[model samples]
Target: ATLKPLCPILEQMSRLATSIRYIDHAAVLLHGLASLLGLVENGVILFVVGCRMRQTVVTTWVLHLALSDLLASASLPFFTYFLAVGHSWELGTTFCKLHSSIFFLNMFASGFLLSAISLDRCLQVVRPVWAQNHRTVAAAHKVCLVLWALAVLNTVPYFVFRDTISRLDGRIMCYYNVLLLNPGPDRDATCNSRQAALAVSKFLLAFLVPLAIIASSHAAVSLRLQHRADLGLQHRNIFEMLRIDEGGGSGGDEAEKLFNQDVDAAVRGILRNAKLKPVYDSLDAVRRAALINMVFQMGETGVAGFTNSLRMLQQKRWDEAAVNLAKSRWYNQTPNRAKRVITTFRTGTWDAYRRRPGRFVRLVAAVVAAFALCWGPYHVFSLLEARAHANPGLRPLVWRGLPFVTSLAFFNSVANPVLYVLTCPDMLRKLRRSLRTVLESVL
Candidate 1:
């Protein structure tokens, strides 16, 4: 045998790829920490809402919010173990399917309930008179039933598709039964089609639809608060929203209009740069827009400084591009906006830039968007499903991406309980009482 072994290119690739051990360490650590946090945080709300506290119309979402977080978070340890051992499965196949089902169940359950909360709030703000009279405790409870039923129903495919595989080495791998390229001997009709089918519906119905309702619901409330004099006098959070949104004055979208023009100017510069063909002319619409926006915010000089990040973008390694972009001072300074742009870069879509998540109402959106952000990787990746007919080459990316995206998705279930505490002070105050009685409160 020759001493050269495999290709030097392959060796060089592994040399670089081998550094991701730190990422795995970070991910597993993050997963374990989230599992512990959600277990306690959601359990406190569960006990308080179930026993010590009053379960009123306002608290209806709380009970169910914690309920699903608990369901999803408890399953994290199993996933953490799987990730820890390199996707090797120790649990039985029955439990494997059950775990997959429970995880997706929480996603739909959380998405519907959060969007419904925003819709409820939108009605309260836009139709306050009608809402005050018509909104009932019974109605809220009934909607929860309808919402959960929708979640349970959408989650059925996950149960049917997830399975455990026996490796030749006598270990097991728990994964979904999907045929992106080759068919398994035990495969069924939907097995080859399930990922594409469920991924599209989950993104459209579970995420995108809910996100629109959440965004527009909050937008309606913001516009009302910005224009309507009575709302500021009525609600406590409205004052915060107004005060935080461009100095509490009726700026009348002037800054936004100016920024839009600036983006146009940057677009012109981008087109000029495209003649040099430094990877600018070959990009799609959304990618071009992201570069234009990035140049607009940081100037063409600044964007030009991202040597490696731009190189990664050129190579079509979107995940790497996002990671590299996130490592800079620009990302830290403009965390919110940069997150949007970087996400736009990754997804190659215009959704993250979908109206800026209603800036002033981010407090309410803080509640709504937190889960959306955590689940964002999966939802955005699922956005591929709808377009998969024209995207035959995409399965390779997702096939290699399952592990990274799944861990990323699990963080949302953890963030669910934590978001509830920070968003509503009363929840924390209540958590403190039980703790001060036992001295268990920190934050």
Candidate 2:
């Protein structure tokens, strides 16, 4: 007799279950899609730009920054899924912590790099004469290194507070999963507090500051471009503005252009000569130093999902997160794969992903959706869900639906790639090219 009244509730539960299943499928798909797009588009843009504009300072810096942004953004999808799906830390303790830590690290590093690029552009226009001497490639590389190192230092705690604990429900959960303020003596209050503080700091450092710098930089660049147009001339060396020209005849416009061209040619010649100098010579040593510095400082635009995944497995114990991870043979092998992926990711995963369209697109979309859903919802929902976390009477009700909403947000991580591919130009081109390359290689 009671069953009759409960049928509607059962039906609702069934529908919700179905919806959750679909959302999971979509999220997985989106993760792959986002990873692929980020790898290819960002990879090709940076690589081609670097090769083509190795000598042009501004373009080089812009492209480098873009590569860094894409690198940090691209890896979030696959790893985030490992967390959202079950907190099942299937990737292992090493991977679990590494994953979260890397995400935070890249987010911070990229934010600073973005701000730096914007500031660089702003200075170029606002104080062009002064900045010419100060803003060199070496200077930019140094700042990028500092930002990355700081990001690493800030995020290393994920490794500390990260651990997998089995719930009373027999489910393994991967998280800091601790209270913020007061706790028992066994509590790692320092780690938990650090994590919370870092999250807020990340939001400010990575997003807010970068945004401001970008806006101001754009304004400065625009003004400078306009000023240059009005004055009429392209400058090769910015210091030319400060050089005194006796009996100034429009700074001998044609003569200045010819002289600049000659100087540029001479510079190129000198660089080439140095590179081709004897195998045992100091020139070769200098060339090696330059390349190492470029990679160490600028990171070569090939940053991949390795470090994050490692941290996750190390900290999160991803393998214990859920039933599937526990049973799967592949899931048992986190350490080796983690190391290999990291190495491959750094050296050539961008190129490989670009060459493999089928795998790339599917992977990248899933990634985009992962970021959107995993990171997007609560902060978004907080604006309207007005409720107290500690309220005695209504607190349980307020929090009851929160998990479902968060799960749905996890589903969002799957949606972004679909939107991205349909809208992005470089993506479409890369997809077509990837297909052609696959056919040719197979044939």
Candidate 3:
């Protein structure tokens, strides 16, 4: 009667045996290929994270992940080979223990490290200042060490359970020795219960708890980033107004007033050549503006070269001024445009002053403004150098910028003429007139 009661369980075990016997070569091939690919993938990750990138808290965690994955991947081939031979153990007891322990270690290590990374990122985003002060690379390293120790501890059960056994069918197998304290009568029941408990503990501690924390940390980080963006959006217009006020607006009203007060005091230093200013003042409104433009293009010192031209203009010798304009290095550098400017001076018509004044003036002014910007920094660097007798630290910045600032001044000279011609209506009108003349003759 007891034999009859056990017949159904025996039949089920026989079905499982039959199922195992009907295996295919495709399984072995796929498994081997997967192991080879995983080894290459994890190996490359270790090389890059360890060598190519800098060691930050995030990179450190990535390095740990790569190491764990690599360890697991390297052992996959041995496990795959073992599986190919119908779950037989040819590598012996020591290797079986190592394989089992490594697998569990990889699982726990990856889970905890991932959770660590997520929490780190979350803390950085939510409590940035605190994280900056507390969450350093050394702290991260210590945390990783602790995590590794925990992972190693988690694998202790696997090392204890894993064993190589000889089966009744003349085969060798590697399996968990769940029946460590053999229950003599109810052996199967007690073994099953112990294995179930082990599995439940592994799932809860290694996988489930860490996964939940990782998910929660990532969600919190995402929420914080969105919150920061919303806050930025709310203050966008106010921040813009503050930026505008930074640039000599109402916020700088007192500074602006003081600057205006100092303008006349600075003018003496700016327009240094007294004789040049008198000759400059003698010219008409249009010519005075054009003269100022030239002075900007070529500095006040450079304007000194046009002394004879300025003198001719002061004496009302229009023809001599036109001749002087055409007989100079400036004329040689820019022939067509220079000739047009010279002709305008001879004609003595304000209408001939600017061929295109609207957009052209603004464009030239923008170019000059840019040149002034570069020049402004060069002067500040000079001032810093002068004060370096007291501070000494400013000397290096000045030395570093010497070549760049010198090159910038040279570039400014070349850029100004090109900029002015682009904005000059006279140049464009002349180009149009020449093209029209050619077309009419051809037609």
Candidate 4:
């Protein structure tokens, strides 16, 4: 009778874990096309810009941005395919490291570049004439080069710290083995400290700061757009028209005065809101930069939020960790025992999930779900085994299954693109043309 309670938990955990693998399988064909389309997209842009949009700063930047995304999209499938197949990177160490690096490098790089795009647009909107006169192809190229360099630097840790280690059972698996010195025997403290440092650095620099900038910039733009309707700034596309008419002779002195008044009003509004405004809100150049910053920020924060929970859980603070992870609503509802472990996530009267539900909450929940579904079995059984050693009645009913949580986590690596496609279908047509073009030109 007691085993019945355990049966449901085990079955539910297995189902959730298995579902992740299946989702990856379902994503394979779509992600395959995504990869091909990404390549073609890059090729077309490269050809167009090198031949046609060569003089257009925006075109050049778009081309460079497309190229980077193509690179990432092309490489994502291989690693994802292996993941869906439940292979823990049986590929050579170099291949493993390279796969991991390319997958994440572009994640950071692509987001960083996108933030740049947003910033560019912000500048275009705020100082249309200035942007037309000052923003150049060379400048775009230079900034994008820096973006790539920064991305490379940020994701280098994956190459340095990520490695494949052999299991006692004669299987090879990929794990983040950061240290050169193997913790001989009693290395828990060292490993924990290292993990904490990595988690903190990654969360703060890569995620939090970028997110802050991105959110702030986007917020500023949104607010400015909200406040400036009187300027006859109807929409994004009409901003250029507004700029052209500004202080131009085609408009009489009255029109120019109107434009000047509008500009003064916008500037006044921005100054008043400066405390809540994004960095560089006062500058056209800076406004657009804020956008790029926002994209980088959001992606990084998602990653950071996920890792932060993992770092806490790894240290085994069940209650505090559970409450911490209560940020994620997805974790609140589930099969039984796993939910019990994180019940603080669902507690009412003053529930964590209820306090301030947001995307960050979902991100954390997803990570914890991955952890519980993948690692929960091992954790429970391991604890049961230790207890059984002390009390015969407390023995586990069946031999514990060393759950394939790591392999399950790999399922997540492929899930991102799938989610992106499902959520952002507008990207589809562009993806296809871009892929076709890139393949025709590059490979």
Best by lDDT: 1
The pairs that clash in candidate 1 are: 435-439
**Model 2, which residues run further than 4 Å from truth?**
1-23, 51-55, 59-87, 177-196, 220-443
Candidate 1: stretches off by over 4 Å: 1-29, 178-194, 224-363, 383-396, 440-443
lDDT ranking, high to low: 1, 3, 4, 2
21 Cα displacement, candidate 3 (Å) = 7.9
Instruction: Kindly report which residue stretches of model 4 are placed more than 4 angstroms away from their true locations once superposed.
Output: 1-55, 80-86, 127-129, 181-186, 204-207, 223-443
Q: After superposition, how far is residue 145 of candidate 4 from its true place, in Å?
A: 0.4
Runs in model 3 deviating more than 4 A are 1-23, 181-192, 234-443
lDDT of 2 by residue, 40-136 (tens): 6566555544553334344444454455446455555655576356434466666666665655565565456556655655555554323433445
lDDT of each: 0.65, 0.44, 0.57, 0.47
User: Residue by residue across 1-443, what tens digits does model 3's lDDT show?
Assistant: 22111212122322321223323467567557756666665554555446544555665765676677667667767866865777567887898899877767866786686567667766665544233334556678889999999999888878886767654444566655655434446655655455556656665675567657766875876676566555556755432210112122343343244212222323353367875777766777556544543553345677677878878888879898887788788767545435645665677543322112112324433443644454545545544443443454665565578545633532333343334335655444555565587799989
TM-score for every candidate vs. truth?
0.58, 0.48, 0.47, 0.45
TM-score (C-alpha, index-matched) for candidate 3: 0.47
User: For all the candidates, what are their Cα RMSDs to the real structure?
Assistant: 24.6, 19.6, 28.9, 23.6
- Model 4 lDDT per residue over 193-307, tens place: 5554555554445444555665666666565545544454456533232243432354444324411223333333433542323322422442223222222222223323444
**Residue 351 Cα positional deviation in candidate 3, in Å, after optimal superposition:** 53
Selected candidate, larger TM-score, 1 vs 4:
1
